[PDB]
Amino acid sequence: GIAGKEKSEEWAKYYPRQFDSWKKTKEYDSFTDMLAKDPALVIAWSGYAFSKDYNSPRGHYYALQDNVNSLRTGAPVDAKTGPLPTACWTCKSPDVPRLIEEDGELEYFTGKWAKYGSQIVNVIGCANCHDDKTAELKVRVPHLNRGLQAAGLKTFEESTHQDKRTLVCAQCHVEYYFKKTEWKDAKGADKTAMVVTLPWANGVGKDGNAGVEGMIKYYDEINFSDWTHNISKTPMLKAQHPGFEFWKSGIHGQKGVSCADCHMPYTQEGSVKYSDHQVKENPLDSMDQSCMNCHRESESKLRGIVHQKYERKEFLNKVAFDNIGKAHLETGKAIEAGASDEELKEVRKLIRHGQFKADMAIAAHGNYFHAPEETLRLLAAGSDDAQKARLLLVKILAKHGVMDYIAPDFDTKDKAQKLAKVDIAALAAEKMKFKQTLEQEWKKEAKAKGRANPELYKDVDTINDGKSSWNKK
Amino acid sequence: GIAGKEKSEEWAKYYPRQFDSWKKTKEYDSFTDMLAKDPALVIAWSGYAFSKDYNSPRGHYYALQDNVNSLRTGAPVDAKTGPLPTACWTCKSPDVPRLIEEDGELEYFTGKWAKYGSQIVNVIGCANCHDDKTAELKVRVPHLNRGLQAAGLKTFEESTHQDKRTLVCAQCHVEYYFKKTEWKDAKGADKTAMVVTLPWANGVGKDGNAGVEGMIKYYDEINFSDWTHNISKTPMLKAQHPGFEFWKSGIHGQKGVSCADCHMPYTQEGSVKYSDHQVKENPLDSMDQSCMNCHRESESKLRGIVHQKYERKEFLNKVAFDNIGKAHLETGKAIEAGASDEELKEVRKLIRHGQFKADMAIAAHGNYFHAPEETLRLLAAGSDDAQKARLLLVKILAKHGVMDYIAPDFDTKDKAQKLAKVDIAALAAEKMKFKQTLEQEWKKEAKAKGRANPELYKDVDTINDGKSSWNKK
Ligand code: HEC
Ligand code: HEC
Ligand code: HEC
Ligand code: HEC
Ligand code: HEC
Ligand code: HEC
Ligand code: HEC
Ligand code: HEC
Ligand code: HEC
Ligand code: HEC
Ligand SMILES: [Ca+2]
Ligand SMILES: [Ca+2]
């Protein structure tokens, strides 16, 4: 066994090669401000946290700190304030399964994100994927098995080794929602938990289908919405990195090539063979071990073939979100023009469904390569749903005496956030205050109670490197 | 050499195995009436021959007879009548390169289809793909090299052996248009030819791109249109089986897997290994021969994987053509309501472009599998172009006093053909009359002049087998 299991440093003496390679994800220190790259996204997520801050993923090394640095988590004053719940910690630290094991799952999912600010202090580590006694692959978060069984699939424990080499990634790289769960503790006090739940009841990655249509069917049946759009007033569904669901629909997934085969290639230093734990941000940069063992041709040729896929996805991504953004703005105009909720009934259903399809397609960044067919198909479907809604809107507008309406420009993050009612300067000030106050208090208490050793990872908070999405001071 | 090489039966004595397997395409005797299956196609091609008769492909054995049987070729009464030109024989017979070599290319392309009715009497044969003296692969139709060179690709003769195994198919399975060409013969007479031309000036199959965008650029630049849509009055572009262009864009094409690898798989009879000349209508039905030499997988699983691709394509196909169909009808309503050509300029450009993208995606039946990515992307693009045009149309219609217009239904061949101004009962009557008179007179002369031996292929005309698209009783 390993004492202080959540502290990956502790494993280093037993497994130096895995520890050293694991820490190398520190090298993946760059992310792209997606709201600045594709401002239409701000309009799509208007009224939601994602319209504030949303960057591409970077090294696992920065997972915990980026979750803290993001405008999405806001600026809490204490453990009872802040916009987001405890569930936001779930896929960022080994301290998560620890707390679930100690205090219970429901208790872990009860309260504000700030509640565990001092408890959840170690980044995605060894304990998130391995047993401390045997080092065998292991998943300690109960949401995964719950989703697998809902999808009619085997639990992690009933799966094969190759299945697990993928499932230890799926414990986080999946689509989910927060299920409001009412419960009662030991003392008999009624509480409310927001439980990470995978909407897999209708299956995922089944015969080439990512599972999006089934998810929509499920979400509508339980009448769930992540938020109400602040422009169109549409009950919306947010998609989040459905890496596993899409991977399962793609050819590699259908052929049994695990995430680990491409992202954690086997390697050999001297006479010792081991798995490279620097989860590769871009396997195309390590083609020799990530691909060429199964593919026989030039690396430049294969990298070129993959780039064509990125171009195709980008082409449909732009079309879909431009249509979706206009659909929201035009719905806002219709409301202003006097259109009733009943009149907007069908329009809203199509915007909800369409954006979810399009969002799911782009929410897992590797989708364009892992699952090009479902990705292109869903961007096509989401775009069409939006266009279908826009055709109804032109008629509704005309009926209300509005002709030739043209939605405003949302071609820059600034213009879009203005339309979304987001004051980034204010949020940045409030967020910077938090980081200089409460956050440092968290790291102070954590070090004092031996919960973490932040001195070993000082280069983790890069908020001031001049590459921040919101801290442009 | 081989005298009367246009008569494939003359090659039997030298290459019996290739001849007997070539004849077995006779077994692929079924086609699907695509206008009955997807009546939206009738609206799409309204004002053009394809709105009358369009079936899926069937055995090479039936190519010439199906060309003669189609309502598209009409009912000529003599050598100077009939709706179509000589170019329609071009990819149906070995007598084609014979006529080009004897009479010259421009002369072969000058005149009505009926002009060569008693000369083009042998179906796709050995001579279409082989030199009669050496049996080496050979292409004798100049349009291919002309297209290849236009696309910056090597000529057939300069291509590799593996390239040639694809090019002997590309001589016919490609997109083309008729180029009105003014010329003067040896005796000083001025003539006009309609030359088969591949619109490849902007390249085809380049880095994952089928080449549709470049073709639109080309066609627009030369102000060419295949026909003026009779409902929307849009100058339209018709796509025709761009098998090679799409194949080149897919993974198999990019990896050098030729059409012949899957469609003319090697076979072993006793100690003789040769190419199976029964060009496989559905290679999935001969997986062991057509795929397992490169893939190690269960037949049901591989077939299931490919079927997924068909479902994805069918999903986007229906969406694109329903939007395109409604766009044409709504444009027709706009014309009736009083919209000018100036008011409809952008609407028509979008319809022309959108339909061409969608049509190219579905025009080569195997595209869904050969090139799933470009197929899905182009159907998405085509559908979007149609939706953009429809958004403009609601506004145009409203400005002309038309509110909430609902296009008529086109869910059955009968309904759509009526909207298309196609009197199939009448067309069928005159076609049958042509078949019973002139066609038979063509057959008589052919046998008498020793140009063909029709008795050897008595089962080729299946117009009365009960599965004709138009000959219904
Ligand atoms: C509560 C609603 C959450 C907040 C706030 C954040 N997450 Fe996550 N998260 C997960 C993965 C697999 C990734 C990487 C893949 C990807 O980003 O597409 C992320 C990444 C982040 C990031 C960095 C990127 C960004 O700027 O958006 C932030 C700031 C972040 N997450 C905040 C996985 C999970 C997960 C597992 C099931 C859950 C429940 C959440 N994340 C919840 C939140
Ligand atoms: C989950 C996302 C992981 C994290 C974080 C870490 N490891 Fe890991 N490890 C993971 C996989 C998918 C694999 C391959 C399993 C296989 O046998 O194919 C590994 C493997 C190991 C092993 C076994 C030997 C080897 O292949 O290298 C060890 C000793 C091991 N991992 C240790 C280890 C340590 C110490 C970590 C923290 C620094 C760590 N792993 C994180 C998945 C994941
Ligand atoms: C090889 C066949 C792979 C398999 C199996 C999986 N991934 Fe992958 N992944 C691969 C590539 C070539 C790429 C594209 C890289 C690029 O920069 O273009 C990806 C990308 C990702 C990403 C996005 C990383 C980022 O944007 O920073 C993630 C999050 C990712 N992959 C996750 C992942 C998971 C969880 C997998 C199994 C379910 C998986 N990948 C499989 C190649 C391969
Ligand atoms: C939850 C605890 C996770 C597990 C287990 C795995 N990933 Fe992950 N991943 C997660 C987050 C929160 C992030 C973003 C971190 C940030 O600061 O932005 C990521 C990121 C990636 C990336 C890109 C960066 C990198 O380290 O290469 C990839 C390619 C990726 N994740 C792949 C991946 C695979 C293949 C996994 C299993 C072996 C895996 N991740 C597990 C959260 C979690
Ligand atoms: C073996 C374990 C593999 C590894 C690692 C990678 N790929 Fe792969 N790939 C594999 C299979 C079995 C297949 C299916 C075809 C078959 O032989 O049955 C594929 C297919 C591809 C494709 C074609 C599909 C497409 O989207 O166009 C591509 C372009 C491809 N693979 C790329 C690729 C890359 C870039 C990899 C490394 C990051 C990679 N593969 C790894 C098996 C394996
Ligand atoms: C080669 C460059 C061609 C020219 C010129 C024309 N056709 Fe063709 N035709 C060609 C192929 C490769 C195929 C099979 C693939 C497919 O998608 O159909 C065909 C098929 C036909 C058919 C049968 C199917 C059908 O449409 O009902 C007919 C009746 C046919 N072709 C007629 C036809 C006419 C009338 C032509 C002049 C406009 C013509 N073809 C030209 C290849 C080529
Ligand atoms: C083009 C559409 C073809 C038609 C019509 C016929 N043949 Fe063919 N043949 C074709 C290809 C692509 C190949 C393979 C060439 C290679 O080298 O890989 C062949 C091959 C032959 C051969 C060589 C031996 C063999 O591989 O079987 C012979 C002797 C041959 N073909 C004869 C032949 C005859 C007699 C045909 C008419 C009945 C005939 N072929 C038609 C392409 C085409
Ligand atoms: C294997 C990798 C193939 C290659 C290379 C090419 N084709 Fe193909 N083709 C293949 C399959 C599996 C299918 C689908 C069959 C089905 O019934 O779904 C096809 C289909 C065609 C078709 C359509 C046939 C019909 O509908 O009757 C045609 C006309 C066709 N293929 C032509 C063709 C050409 C000319 C190719 C090279 C340019 C080519 N195929 C390559 C598998 C393979
Ligand atoms: C023109 C002279 C052609 C050449 C050379 C090749 N094909 Fe063809 N193909 C052509 C026609 C006009 C038709 C339709 C015939 C009808 O009566 O409907 C076809 C059809 C096919 C099919 C389906 C039927 C079959 O025999 O399998 C396929 C799969 C197909 N063609 C593939 C193909 C390949 C791979 C070729 C090169 C070896 C090839 N065709 C050459 C016209 C012509
Ligand atoms: C060897 C000459 C091949 C033949 C015959 C067929 N396939 Fe193939 N296939 C081959 C390669 C080189 C690749 C690309 C991946 C790589 O190893 O580099 C592929 C890829 C596929 C795929 C994946 C792409 C996709 O659309 O999902 C599938 C599903 C596939 N091949 C199917 C397939 C079938 C059904 C075949 C016979 C009709 C077939 N291939 C023949 C090489 C070869
Ligand atoms: Ca979600
Ligand atoms: Ca054409």
Alpha carbon nearest to ligand 10 atom 42, residue: B294
Give the A window 103-142 contacts with B, CB below 8 Å: none
> Would you call A305 an interface residue with chain B, using a CB distance cutoff of 8 Å?
yes
Q: Using alpha carbons only, how large is chain A's radius of gyration in Å?
A: 23
Residues 6+ apart with CB under 8 A from A388: A350, A354, B387
| B95, B64 contact by CB (below 8 A) | no
The DSSP annotation for A381-413 comes to: HHHHHHHHHHHHHHHHHHHTT--S--PPP--SH
Identify which of A175, A180, A220 has the alpha carbon closest to the alpha carbon of residue A198: A175
**Mutation pick for ligand 7 pocket among B13, B18, B124 (CB with most ligand atoms within 8 Å):** B18
Q: Which residues, listed in sequence order, are joined to residue B273 by a DSSP beta bridge?
A: B268
Same-domain status, B391 and B435: no
| A321, A202 contact by CB (below 8 A) | no
Same-domain status, B86 and B181: yes
Phi, psi dihedral angles at B289 (to 5 degrees): -85, -45
The answer to whether residue A408 is domain-embedded is yes
For residue B407, give both structure tokens.
């296009």
| B244, B91 contact by CB (below 8 A) | no
Same-domain status, A111 and A225: yes
Residue with tokens 């063509």: B442
Work out the end-to-end distance of chain A between its first and last CA atoms, rounded to an integer number of angstroms: 47
Most A CBs within 10 A among B330, B374, B391, hence the mutation to make, goes to B391
Could you tell me the CA-to-CA distances from B283 to A223, B303, B372, B449 in Å, in that order?
A: 46, 10, 17, 39
Q: What is the resolution of this structure in A?
A: 1.9
Question: How far is Cα B281 from Cα B366, in angstroms, rounded to an integer?
Answer: 10
B311 CB neighbours in chain A (<8 A) are: 208
Residues 6+ apart with CB under 8 A from B104: none
| B331, B231 contact by CB (below 8 A) | yes
Question: How wide is the angle at C-alpha A171 spanned by C-alphas A168 and A172, nearest 5°?
Answer: 115
Question: How far is Cα A138 from Cα A147, in angstroms, rounded to an integer?
Answer: 16
Residues 6+ apart with CB under 8 A from B458: none
The answer to whether residue A438 is domain-embedded is yes
Identify which of B161, B134, B168, B93 has the alpha carbon closest to the alpha carbon of residue B11: B134
Whether B143 has a binding-site annotation, put simply, is no
Same-domain status, B240 and B378: no
Phi, psi dihedral angles at B57 (to 5 degrees): -75, 155
Chain centroid, CA B190 distance in Å: 30
CATH of the domain at A56: 1.10.1130.10
In this structure, the strands spanning A266-269 and A235-236 are: unpaired
What torsion do the CA atoms of B236, B237, B241, B246 make, to the nearest 10 degrees?
-130
Burial of A465 (0-12, 13-18, 19+ CB in 10 A): exposed
Q: For B304, which of A207, A251, A305 is closest by C-beta distance?
A: A207
* Interchain pair A377, B316: CB under 8 A: yes
Same-domain status, A222 and A186: yes
**Mutation pick for ligand 4 pocket among A60, A72, A92, A171 (CB with most ligand atoms within 8 Å):** A60
Helices (H), A116-228: 142-150, 161-170, 212-221
The answer to whether residue B252 is domain-embedded is yes
**E strands, B266-413, in order:** 266-269, 272-275
**E strands, B185-238, in order:** 190-197, 227-228, 235-236
Same-domain status, B156 and B14: yes
Same-domain status, A189 and A332: no
Question: How far is Cα B126 from Cα B135, in angstroms, rounded to an integer?
Answer: 9
Could you tell me the CA-to-CA distances from A354 to A388, B36, B387 in Å, in that order?
A: 10, 30, 15
SS3 B452: coil
Q: HSE (CB half, 13 Å, CA atoms) of A465? A: 12
* Interchain pair B384, A381: CB under 8 A: no
Same-domain status, A393 and A448: no
The answer to whether residue A266 is domain-embedded is yes
* Segment (H or E) for B43: helix B40-44
Whether B175 has a binding-site annotation, put simply, is yes
In this structure, the strands spanning A272-275 and A227-228 are: unpaired
Q: For A394, which of B207, B251, B394 is closest by C-beta distance?
A: B394
- Look at chain A and count its residues: 473
SS3 A14: coil
Residue with tokens 């080729």: B460
Phi, psi dihedral angles at A445 (to 5 degrees): -60, -45
Q: HSE (CB half, 13 Å, CA atoms) of B137? A: 18
B250 within ligand 8 shell (Cβ under 6 A): no
Phi, psi dihedral angles at A256 (to 5 degrees): 75, 25
Residue with tokens 């006009």: B192
For residue A75, give both structure tokens.
């600026």
Q: How many domains does chain B have?
A: 2
The residue among B397, B422, B447 that closes a domain is B422
Same-domain status, B105 and B225: yes
Whether A143 has a binding-site annotation, put simply, is no
The DSSP annotation for A175-187 comes to: --EEEEEEEE-TT
Phi, psi dihedral angles at A466 (to 5 degrees): 75, 10
Residues 6+ apart with CB under 8 A from B47: B227, B228, B229, B230, B231, B236, B420, B421
* Interchain pair A308, B208: CB under 8 A: yes
The answer to whether residue B466 is domain-embedded is no
Identify which of B157, B99, B148, B89 has the alpha carbon closest to the alpha carbon of residue B124: B89
Q: Which residues, listed in sequence order, are joined to residue B195 by a DSSP beta bridge?
A: B179
The answer to whether residue A150 is domain-embedded is yes
Question: How far is Cα B249 from Cα B214, in angstroms, rounded to an integer?
Answer: 14
In this structure, the strands spanning B190-197 and B177-184 are: antiparallel
- C-alpha B281 to ligand 12 mean position (Å): 23
Alpha carbon nearest to ligand 2 atom 19, residue: A275
Cβ atoms within 10 Å, residue B404 = 12
For residue B208, give both structure tokens.
């994952």
Question: How far is Cα A174 from Cα A145, in angstroms, rounded to an integer?
Answer: 12
**What 8-state DSSP symbol labels residue B436?**
I
Chain centroid, CA A359 distance in Å: 11
Ligand closest to the CA atom of residue B218:
12
- Rama region for B203: left / alpha / beta (φ>0; ψ in -120 to 50; rest): left
Residue with tokens 């280093």: A12
Q: State the residue range of the domain holding A274.
A: 1-279+423-458
SS3 B28: coil
Same-domain status, A161 and A266: yes
Residue with tokens 């802040």: A82
SS3 B429: helix
Phi, psi dihedral angles at A371 (to 5 degrees): -145, 65
Question: How far is Cα B57 from Cα B282, in angstroms, rounded to an integer?
Answer: 11
> Would you call B207 an interface residue with chain A, using a CB distance cutoff of 8 Å?
yes
Question: How far is Cα A361 from Cα A372, in angstroms, rounded to an integer?
Answer: 9
Chain centroid, CA B187 distance in Å: 35
The answer to whether residue A74 is domain-embedded is yes
Solved using: X-ray
**E strands, A286-374, in order:** none
> Would you call B304 an interface residue with chain A, using a CB distance cutoff of 8 Å?
yes
Question: How far is Cα B116 from Cα B98, in angstroms, rounded to an integer?
Answer: 12
Residues 6+ apart with CB under 8 A from B355: B44, B236, B237, B324, B382, B385, B386
Q: Which residues, listed in sequence order, are joined to residue B197 by a DSSP beta bridge?
A: B177
Residue with tokens 């826009």: A390
Point out the ligand 8 atom lying closest to the alpha carbon of residue B58. 27
**E strands, B138-252, in order:** 177-184, 190-197, 227-228, 235-236
Which residue in chain A is spatially nearest to B388 when comparing CA positions? A387
The Cα of A249 is separated from the nearest Cα of chain B by a number of Å equal to 10
Could you tell me the CA-to-CA distances from B86 to B90, B96, B113, B260 in Å, in that order?
A: 8, 10, 4, 29
For residue B300, give both structure tokens.
């049901």
The DSSP annotation for B320-357 comes to: HHHHHHHHHHHHHHHHHTT--TTTTHHHHHHHHHHHHH
Cβ atoms within 10 Å, residue A15 = 17
For residue B246, give both structure tokens.
């799409």
The Cα of B46 is separated from the nearest Cα of chain A by a number of Å equal to 24
CATH of the domain at A334: 1.20.140.10
Same-domain status, A191 and A150: yes
Cβ atoms within 10 Å, residue A407 = 17
Question: What is the b/e burial string over A278-297, where b = at least 16 CB atoms within 10 angstroms of the residue's CB?
Answer: bbbbebbebbebbbeeeeee
Same-domain status, B14 and B162: yes
Phi, psi dihedral angles at B26 (to 5 degrees): -60, -25
Chain centroid, CA B268 distance in Å: 32
* Interchain pair A391, B391: CB under 8 A: yes
- Rama region for B103: left / alpha / beta (φ>0; ψ in -120 to 50; rest): alpha
Identify which of A114, A113, A169 has the alpha carbon closest to the alpha carbon of residue A144: A169
| B35, B53 contact by CB (below 8 A) | yes
The answer to whether residue B13 is domain-embedded is yes
The DSSP annotation for A42-74 comes to: HHHTTTSGGGT--B----GGGHHHHHHHSGGG-
| A155, A145 contact by CB (below 8 A) | yes
For residue A151, give both structure tokens.
């999808």
Q: For A305, which of B254, B374, B379 is closest by C-beta distance?
A: B254
Q: Which residues, listed in sequence order, are joined to residue A112 by a DSSP beta bridge?
A: A85
> Would you call B355 an interface residue with chain A, using a CB distance cutoff of 8 Å?
no
Work out the end-to-end distance of chain B between its first and last CA atoms, rounded to an integer number of angstroms: 48
Could you tell me the CA-to-CA distances from B266 to B170, B269, B272, B275, B278 in Å, in that order?
A: 20, 10, 10, 4, 11
Cβ atoms within 10 Å, residue B160 = 12
